[PDB]
Amino acid sequence: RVLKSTEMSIGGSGENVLSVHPVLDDNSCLFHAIAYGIFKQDSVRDLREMVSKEVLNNPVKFNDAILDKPNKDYAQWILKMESWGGAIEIGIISDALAVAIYVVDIDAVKIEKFNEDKFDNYILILFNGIHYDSLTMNEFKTVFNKNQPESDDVLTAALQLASNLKQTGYSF
Amino acid sequence: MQIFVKTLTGKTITLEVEPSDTIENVKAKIQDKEGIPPDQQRLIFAGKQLEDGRTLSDYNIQKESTLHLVLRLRG
């Protein structure tokens, strides 16, 4: 059993394996990665519409300064299939689906957590600077819980995987 | 002194700063507490985006002032 560059054993025993699960490399990859992790089924349009609606309905929280463009303009912009999702989308989708989203940032070798204090359940998405993939355990499990015994080891493996990928030329 | 930094997920981050601190310095402090790289950080105060080269003093940042942190992370 030899591990590939996109794989990392979890914990001291290494019985379970964390791996990259690639999604379609289109302009909607953030949404594909989140949909796979949470639903195990693709969704882009519904997720973009959810974000658009939340922004429109909350102009005080998502003001022009926060969005770096007028609220009404952002709400239409995020509906375009070519518009790249980011932290703003992640936060909104996380809140809406009641699952924390942990961004494993390859270039930084850090995990950016969204809503870790609200929801115990979390998914991991891998960010290389211009693209998102999903992270899975044993080629299947995507939803983890931070209070389960193996959670620390899962996060440790995610960080070590990110470090290895940074070192082998995978971040942009 | 103390300033606060609020995220869009509702969390608040306390910072110890001097009026002499540049926005860059502040992002570096946020990186220390939270591990967020400065290049992914956007800071907003009083409806204005804060620029790397200026100081808190330049924007009238004072006691218990609240900044808003928004991340980029677009892919």
Short mmCIF file of C-alpha atoms in Angstrom, two decimals, chain A residues 20-111:
data_model
loop_
_atom_site.label_atom_id
_atom_site.label_comp_id
_atom_site.label_asym_id
_atom_site.label_seq_id
_atom_site.Cartn_x
_atom_site.Cartn_y
_atom_site.Cartn_z
CA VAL A 20 -8.10 14.88 -2.64
CA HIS A 21 -11.40 14.42 -4.46
CA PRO A 22 -11.18 16.48 -7.68
CA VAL A 23 -14.19 18.44 -8.94
CA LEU A 24 -14.91 19.92 -12.38
CA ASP A 25 -12.37 22.63 -13.19
CA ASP A 26 -14.95 25.18 -14.35
CA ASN A 27 -15.60 28.64 -12.90
CA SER A 28 -17.94 27.08 -10.32
CA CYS A 29 -15.45 24.78 -8.61
CA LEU A 30 -16.05 26.28 -5.16
CA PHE A 31 -19.72 25.36 -5.43
CA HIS A 32 -18.98 21.88 -6.82
CA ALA A 33 -16.60 21.20 -3.93
CA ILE A 34 -19.08 22.31 -1.25
CA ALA A 35 -22.01 20.48 -2.88
CA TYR A 36 -20.03 17.27 -3.06
CA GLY A 37 -18.85 17.53 0.54
CA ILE A 38 -22.28 18.30 2.00
CA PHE A 39 -24.79 16.66 -0.39
CA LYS A 40 -22.68 14.07 -2.19
CA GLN A 41 -24.50 15.50 -5.20
CA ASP A 42 -23.65 18.38 -7.48
CA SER A 43 -25.34 21.73 -7.10
CA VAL A 44 -24.28 25.10 -8.44
CA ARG A 45 -27.34 27.15 -9.41
CA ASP A 46 -29.18 26.66 -6.11
CA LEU A 47 -26.07 27.63 -4.16
CA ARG A 48 -25.48 30.79 -6.24
CA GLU A 49 -29.15 31.74 -5.86
CA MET A 50 -28.95 31.21 -2.09
CA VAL A 51 -25.98 33.57 -1.88
CA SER A 52 -27.64 36.17 -4.13
CA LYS A 53 -30.80 36.11 -2.01
CA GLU A 54 -28.91 36.39 1.31
CA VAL A 55 -26.91 39.38 0.05
CA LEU A 56 -30.02 41.17 -1.27
CA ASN A 57 -31.95 40.51 1.93
CA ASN A 58 -29.13 41.75 4.18
CA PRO A 59 -27.81 45.10 2.81
CA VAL A 60 -26.63 46.27 6.21
CA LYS A 61 -24.41 43.24 6.80
CA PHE A 62 -23.43 42.87 3.15
CA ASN A 63 -22.92 46.53 2.36
CA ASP A 64 -20.99 47.92 -0.62
CA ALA A 65 -17.77 48.24 1.38
CA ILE A 66 -17.97 44.66 2.66
CA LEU A 67 -18.63 43.32 -0.84
CA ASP A 68 -16.23 45.65 -2.67
CA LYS A 69 -19.07 46.54 -5.05
CA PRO A 70 -22.67 47.71 -4.72
CA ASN A 71 -24.98 45.22 -2.99
CA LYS A 72 -27.47 44.96 -5.87
CA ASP A 73 -24.62 44.53 -8.35
CA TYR A 74 -22.98 41.77 -6.29
CA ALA A 75 -26.27 39.90 -6.03
CA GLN A 76 -26.55 39.76 -9.84
CA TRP A 77 -22.83 39.11 -10.33
CA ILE A 78 -22.76 35.96 -8.19
CA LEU A 79 -25.54 34.48 -10.36
CA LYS A 80 -23.22 34.37 -13.40
CA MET A 81 -21.71 30.94 -13.94
CA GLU A 82 -18.34 32.59 -14.62
CA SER A 83 -18.15 34.37 -11.24
CA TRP A 84 -15.69 32.78 -8.80
CA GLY A 85 -17.04 32.07 -5.32
CA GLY A 86 -14.94 32.98 -2.28
CA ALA A 87 -15.08 33.53 1.49
CA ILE A 88 -18.29 35.57 1.22
CA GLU A 89 -20.07 32.64 -0.45
CA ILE A 90 -18.53 30.12 1.95
CA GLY A 91 -19.79 31.94 5.03
CA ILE A 92 -23.32 32.30 3.66
CA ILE A 93 -23.59 28.70 2.46
CA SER A 94 -22.16 27.40 5.72
CA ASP A 95 -24.77 29.33 7.72
CA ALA A 96 -27.58 28.15 5.42
CA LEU A 97 -26.72 24.44 5.49
CA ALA A 98 -25.64 24.29 9.16
CA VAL A 99 -22.24 22.77 8.43
CA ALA A 100 -18.91 24.46 9.14
CA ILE A 101 -16.59 24.77 6.17
CA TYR A 102 -12.84 24.48 6.70
CA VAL A 103 -10.68 25.80 3.87
CA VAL A 104 -7.36 23.99 3.64
CA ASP A 105 -5.09 26.65 2.15
CA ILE A 106 -2.13 25.06 0.35
CA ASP A 107 0.03 28.12 -0.17
CA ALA A 108 -0.39 29.29 3.42
CA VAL A 109 -0.33 25.81 4.95
CA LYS A 110 -3.19 26.93 7.22
CA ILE A 111 -6.84 26.07 7.75
#
